[PDB]
Design a protein around this ligand. Structure first.
Ligand SMILES: [Cl-]
Ligand SMILES: [Cl-]
Ligand SMILES: [Cl-]
Lengths: 400, 400, 400
């Protein structure tokens, strides 16, 4: 039966996506202080299970089900059986994407968000924000379907190969809302323009985590390809170049400017390069992959510094990596991608405009609505830990 | 040639099984104190090599060779060549299973078992217990054989898709024998009903380890499927749901009862869910996978507390995860599995009875015989470290 | 299209090779002191990105391009498009090999080499040494080419299945040059024959790293196979036996001689066994894989002790593992490999002689030339950190 190879491919790609969970756990846990080390681990596994349960129970239905009004899908609840012989593999892969998007959120708020806060934000992400935006961008993109209808953004021509916007930007916007609402760590910023660095206690784990993320990204992009043809290997090369030029560019910056704890920035550079090529890995050349990735690295470095100037404390640099990288990648698609991947009646300017409309829509929905709901939640159920718990650390203070 | 795809699948699944070794190393090492950190690592790599050598030299022969009397197989020693074009891939995968079962044993006895004790218990597991029980349950299940004869349990109808009993229960029973014989850590229990917690010093590594185990489990189940058809992806979905509902259920328990160091229990919940679906991933629905996994999570939580009440010190909760999860999964198969996977002349009651006979046989052989031999060994070659070595830690005390 | 399965195989094997990067990071970082922990991580990610950029930009061209004079290839710069439907997958896999070879170098010089020194040595490796030796040994071995010409060593009959010489020996020779030039750590050796051990502070990570390397090695060997046939699974079995007998033999030595911190040696044994079978995994029996791997383990143990006697400080034992294992594997091919894999007009003696010529050529070029250039560089740009930085540690002293 023909359908075997593609199913096996998707299943293996889904496995690689799951290693990104290990990667996030390591990346975050090494960027935090020992007194907070256990919290990050509990949240990463807990967040995963919650997200999976939600996506299985109804998130897949909302995102990929037949569209009632075009807002939201309305079938595929408690996913089990299908007549589409690619759908089960696809469901598993898409479940891993949902888990990715939500996991992304949690690294920004480290060292001062209460545990039940991670859970409630994860619920919001998995239940509403991710599947709804998902439907609008990718609602019609069901592997092996005969019967599918495009989401409204998708129909206007919005392109996102593997989720620079759908996964990465959605996570990043929600992370930005979270850090603005809970506020900066004690001791991070002082009085006028004072910025103290707070360094993780297990930074080798952050390099392990960077390599695990990089590995998982091959599955992330490779499993989104929708088929097999002789151009699949070009998605892999472009993934490798995106990440490596992201890091290499930051390395050049960093040698030049003699950055202290340069390890944080080069590692984030790699991740930003990977995020940026996620929109377009299938539609660009190797030179353009290097270019897009490299620029994303540079953007991540400058965005990190900008956030500090704004007194926003994003512990692992979710916003510089995922949000700025994801916006950059989504727009860059219009600039660099071979025009044959666009709508026939779209020029590069037309593609730029719809990529931008997607970016803006994502910001309004994934920053705007969470910002309002999380601010509401926080008035009646404070999300920041007590000063005592922050000082002593979530390990002893929160988890005894 | 047709046989290529299945061979490549098995080889990749075997690779995933090997990442479970990394996962066990991290899971255990994070649950132990720094003064013992090196011991756990030395034992994990050492145990692997010993087990592999044994399985290659003769364990495969005993487990899968043509059956002399039905007790034990008697060909395939020093495995090299075959006329079965699937046998070499299969041998490698089965070798990784043997290594899995033995590795499982070692986390229960942490912080007070002498190194050479791990080695001798590993020898017992790999040489006798695992391959013999293996033969009885799976002796006929040689990928691509024309000529095979079923083991006696297998012949009566005993079902175990990927080893809830064969791998997980066997390891767990041997772990239980080991902890009973070496006894509890100093400072764990006091006088009447006193229970002191002893917490690991690198618990982020235990989350890394949980994700690596979860990833490896896809290979563990996927490589046991015996073929490819369009239902393979359902084994993957059921694996994902088993693990995630295991963790999710414990999370619900834990929020409710406000558990201290909840991270230990949610992580074990995930592993218990995975163990439970290992018996039946190919024969149940997605809803039943969630159900079986979820119940396994709950059982693991309550079993953990029960063992403490019995003053049994199982450091990483091998028995709650692997043994209680494995027994539960093996019995649950009769309750939930589609009856088409049973013998034609078996009802659910008949299947329940043979699943139970398998459970009991496993306990008698894998707990009973090791308990007796290890107790004998311990009289003449004490397996517990000296109090000085336990207090100072196996790193300095044992490994200088 | 037929070419799909092999491409997917190569891409997945390349993914496994990338996990070796994670493995090296863990292996080295656990063998170093906490005060140096961050440096090792920064160097591992930085080294990767640099190597990738070089290999993409021109290293692939030098190594695999059409041969101008036979010294060096001269096309394939900024690799992008091809008419060979296997070439892109191959390029990615070969890029990961180049990164492997260079990464290997860096663990020997830990705790006292300046960061910019790692970068400059990496540039030398990736720009000149690896691709040029690569061309001579493997220049004609382009997956799916019709038009290829063999490198001069290759033409004489030099065999190296996956790079015991090309990857491992090249890295090891360059590592040896580096440690001789920067010299031993402060406090390592004293006066006459005094040897103080300096132990890593996170040795559990070195076991994680050993398992990740072992896993990646399946991809390393499997992706070098050049095709699919029914003997591919035998390369996997031989990989498993090589590594496990390497460790098992050292375990036997170590129990016997009661080695302190035995974990370091057994782990290195496993890696040495894997390195040794890298030359011949496709051409030997399972018994010979065990034999070659086992001997490599023993050699690694004795080489470790020898280097200490010579007052050479190789922190993670790169030279005992990669160089001594790689030389041993390359020569062992002549001894054990089925003669059908040789040139028709070559006996075992003829094969021995060309394997030896390859070994010697590699030493002259990959030790001799780097030794001279790095010694020159060091006169004008000292590669060793200041005593203050070594004592305080590269984390604070170098990275603030
Ligand atoms: Cl935190
Ligand atoms: Cl221990
Ligand atoms: Cl260093």
């Amino acid at each position: 039966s023909e359908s075997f190879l593609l199913n096996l491919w998707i299943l293996l790609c889904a496995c690689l996506v799951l290693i990104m969970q290990a990667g996030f756990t390591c990346f975050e846990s090494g960027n935090v202080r020992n007194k907070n080390s256990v919290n990050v681990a509990l949240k990463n596994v807990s967040d995963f299970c919650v997200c999976a349960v939600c996506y299985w129970a109804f998130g897949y239905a909302l995102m990929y089900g037949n569209s009632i009004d075009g807002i939201v899908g309305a079938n595929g609840f408690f996913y089990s059986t299908t007549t589409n012989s690619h759908e089960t593999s696809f469901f598993l892969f898409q479940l891993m994407f949902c888990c990715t998007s939500a996991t992304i959120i949690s690294g920004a708020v480290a060292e001062r968000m209460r545990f039940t806060g991670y859970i409630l934000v994860t619920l919001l992400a998995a239940s509403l924000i991710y599947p709804l935006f998902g439907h609008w961008a990718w609602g019609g993109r069901i592997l092996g379907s005969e019967t599918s209808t495009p989401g409204w953004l998708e129909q206007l021509g919005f392109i996102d190969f593997a989720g620079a916007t759908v996964v990465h930007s959605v996570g990043g916007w929600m992370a930005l809302a979270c850090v603005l609402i809970i506020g900066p760590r004690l001791g991070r910023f002082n009085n006028k323009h004072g910025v103290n660095q707070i360094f993780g206690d297990n930074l080798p784990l952050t390099a392990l985590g960077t390599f695990l993320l990089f590995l998982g990204w091959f599955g992330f992009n490779g499993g989104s390809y929708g088929k097999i043809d002789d151009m699949l290997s070009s998605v892999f090369v472009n993934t490798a170049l995106g990440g490596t030029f992201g890091g290499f560019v930051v390395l050049l910056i960093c040698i030049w400017q003699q950055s202290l704890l340069s390890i944080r920035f080069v590692l984030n550079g790699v991740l930003a390069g990977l995020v940026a090529i996620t929109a377009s890995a299938n539609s660009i050349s190797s030179i353009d992959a290097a270019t897009i990735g490299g620029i994303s690295g540079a953007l991540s470095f400058f965005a990190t510094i900008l956030l500090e100037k704004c007194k926003i404390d994003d512990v692992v640099s979710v916003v510089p990596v995922h949000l700025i990288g994801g916006i950059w990648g989504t727009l860059a698609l219009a600039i660099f991608a071979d025009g044959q991947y666009f709508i026939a009646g779209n020029s590069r300017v037309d593609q730029f405009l719809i990529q931008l409309l997607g970016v803006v829509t994502c910001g309004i929905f994934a920053f705007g609505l969470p910002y309002m709901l999380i601010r509401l939640l926080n008035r009646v159920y404070p999300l920041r830990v007590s000063p005592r718990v922050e000082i002593l650390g979530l390990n002893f203070g929160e988890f005894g």
